[PDB]
Design a protein around this ligand. Sequence first.
Ligand SMILES: Cc1cc(NC(=O)C2CC2)on1
Ligand code: NA
Length: 123
Amino acid sequence: SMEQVAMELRLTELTRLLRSVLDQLQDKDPARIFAQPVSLKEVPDYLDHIKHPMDFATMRKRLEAQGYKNLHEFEEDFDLIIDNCMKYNARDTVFYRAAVRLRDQGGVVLRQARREVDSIGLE
Ligand SMILES: Cc1cc(NC(=O)C2CC2)on1
Ligand code: NA
């Protein structure tokens, strides 16, 4: 149907916006601490601590499959990256501190992203 095509166009446009958002958020992780899944070779007990691992590569996979239907779903995964890190790692670590900085700098990007999604009507 034409209606189905219209919704699919909206999803494609949301995906384009979120790709730009994801690139901007990842730029706020210059150490690439969140670029890939936490290594279970490096951290064998990780899944005993963290029930829903997340990282930028995993987000990008979902994104290019158009697996984010709205901004909320995308933000949920971004928040997992930060929240998982701040639980597993202590306050005085480069890991925890990278998450705090990503959260703070990322908030700015996401604030304007919400306006664009609403204004254009992408969800
Ligand atoms: C625990 C834990 C580890 C990480 N990140 C990394 O180790 C990437 C390679 C630098 O995030 N949380
Ligand atoms: Na902790």
